[PDB]
Amino acid sequence: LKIRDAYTIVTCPGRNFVTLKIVTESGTHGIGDATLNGREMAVAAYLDEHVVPALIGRDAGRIEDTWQYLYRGAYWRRGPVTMTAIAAVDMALWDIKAKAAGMPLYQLLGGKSRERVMTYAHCTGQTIEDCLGEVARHVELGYRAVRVQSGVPGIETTYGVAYEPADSSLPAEHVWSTEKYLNHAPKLFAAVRERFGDDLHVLHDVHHRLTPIEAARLGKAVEPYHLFWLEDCVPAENQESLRLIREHTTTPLAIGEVFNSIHDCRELIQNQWIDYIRMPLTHGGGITAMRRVADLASLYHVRTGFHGPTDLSPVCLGAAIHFDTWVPNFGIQEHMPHTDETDAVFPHDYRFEDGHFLAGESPGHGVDIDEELAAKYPYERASLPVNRLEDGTLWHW
Amino acid sequence: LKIRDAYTIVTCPGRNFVTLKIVTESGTHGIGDATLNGREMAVAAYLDEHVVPALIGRDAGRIEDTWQYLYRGAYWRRGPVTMTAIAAVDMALWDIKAKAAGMPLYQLLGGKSRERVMTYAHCTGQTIEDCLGEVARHVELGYRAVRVQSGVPGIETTYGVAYEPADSSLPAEHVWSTEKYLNHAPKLFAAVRERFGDDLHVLHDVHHRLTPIEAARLGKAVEPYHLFWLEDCVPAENQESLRLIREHTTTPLAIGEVFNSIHDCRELIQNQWIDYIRMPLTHGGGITAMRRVADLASLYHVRTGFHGPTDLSPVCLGAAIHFDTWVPNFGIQEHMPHTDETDAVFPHDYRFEDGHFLAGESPGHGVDIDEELAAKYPYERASLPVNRLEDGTLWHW
């Protein structure tokens, strides 16, 4: 019942992961993802020094109380380090509760709303032709949906083209030209449609680099290609940033992988400025908070599109697949396969087949951590890149 | 020119402080406050492991570029841990810049706008009588302004009454009744006015415990007592929370000590829902960011009221006083005196006289850190309390 022990595990089976483990007096345990790419040790310290000591002796079944205790109790509310710490606890407690209930997590949430969970794959290449080759191979793999990114002529490096974003100890320095990208990007989607037809879902990630009127122009330009979404058009700390885009294009819009709170997107949703909300479990306060975000989204026809990169661990992925299985307003689940070393450290029972995930049936979220294996891979610092304009201006990566 | 070294110092001369020191190749150095009460080691890790390595080799003079580099470069934007780390770097770089210019910091910002910086003192007591005794005592010390808090009959513990909030390793557990507080509080201000008259500035901190209509009720009830401000009426992640209060009372409102970004308060300011913005340098992204916040506030007659508790170090206080000396739309500066041990660890040249601060004249922000002395006071974990309603509901402390 009560929490006997709680501790973090930091491991680098291909890239860094931070995991919270919670053990009850009865011996049942649960785990939560706590990985915050490029800032990992900040969450590890938040948990180790400040949260973990407060968890000892608490009733593990008190999920809601623990969430509020950590969210309100921190005094300094919201934020990526804060909410990732809270998310790790929350995921671990839901894991415990589902185990206690003898049910897979999706059953505890209200049962399945779908028989499988559609994903998309990253297709990338230096030239449009290179990208098209990748689309072909993934379609052969059974993917119904692909994200397409390709190099921009006249730009040395562009987002999503070589791919492990955090591939340097210190931030790599990329250079950017918005105008060259705006002129080129539509050619990628035209080429994809010409070769692969209309049935395929095609996604694109603008990755924060445009101003709103620039994103409006781009949305308009890509209307003929019927994208599944155009993602992260503009930095959105000021939520009104989406308004001009929405008023000028019918290309569907996705945002929110960089968010950690319903307060980051309440207006985006209520004003109907987006079609997909991307904030995932480990950065968005866990199951407890994301259920609330998804529900708000549902009132406005907005669907979930969980961020699912390699820098969220299989713990997040398994939990996410359970959530995806239940949530009425599911949109899509992003999939970037983990390394074999990562998969082995995090035994799990979710399955991928024919372009879709199937939720596990084991009690809990179905993921565990092999601590002794984890210990074979010590932490290695790795930072996300920064992006600069051609004049040296520090821009948005 | 270039940064050759950067590191944190953690010390507990009466309570925990975290400081960042940056040193250049010419041997000049600056320091910045990085203290985040009750979550101190999360910021320490954020700086040590992720920020400090990226500072080495950077041009010390590039304050703006460094701020953007850390702010945008982090990818996960905003948050108390994030923005405190950024603030610490920013403060240290401004310290260096001022030293390089051979000027006290206020000169660098645009020079002096006032001859002294008005403060307010905390006056607290179990009963109203106890509090009134403390007001008299502080008026004797020359304070022109006092915050008043007193116990609520029928409630064991209330905010600001016995005072160091973080007085426990793990969070102390307080019990709360809104209804008893609402009936009682107006009696305190009535008594202050009866004994001390009209000329004294009287402030009160609601400390997050009310709903909007409750705070509207309170604001109206205390109008006859003409408070300088009513602070932190309601949790304000949803900034619209202030609207009903502002529509129902003319008691001036203050908010923001728990904010870390202009995006936490842009709407509060533009809609004229507040009179004072309380976000301080060390939690609000430093001088660079707070200049922008203050300037935004100025367009709407909003004034600065920096949070100034013991849990922001003399480094923040010195920098704050410099800032207060320049900023046109200065309102007031909170003052909770630090312990002698703290003042010793952080030698400084700002002065307190007759209820006001006088800015230092030494180049830099005028504060330094005695690292040898700091080493004599090891970190001691201390958490902020939580607040529960009478039925056990985890509430806002």
Ligand SMILES: O=C(O)[C@H](O)[C@@H](O)[C@H](O)[C@H](O)CO
């Ligand atoms: O849509 C996505 O998958 C994201 O943009 C990732 O590529 C992020 O850049 C990375 O997860 C940050 O750590």
Ligand SMILES: O=C(O)[C@H](O)[C@@H](O)[C@H](O)[C@H](O)CO
């Ligand atoms: O107005 C104030 O001085 C604040 O409310 C402080 O009392 C905070 O509670 C404390 O600084 C949290 O660390």
Ligand SMILES: [Mg+2]
């Ligand atoms: Mg993305």
Ligand SMILES: [Mg+2]
């Ligand atoms: Mg306060």
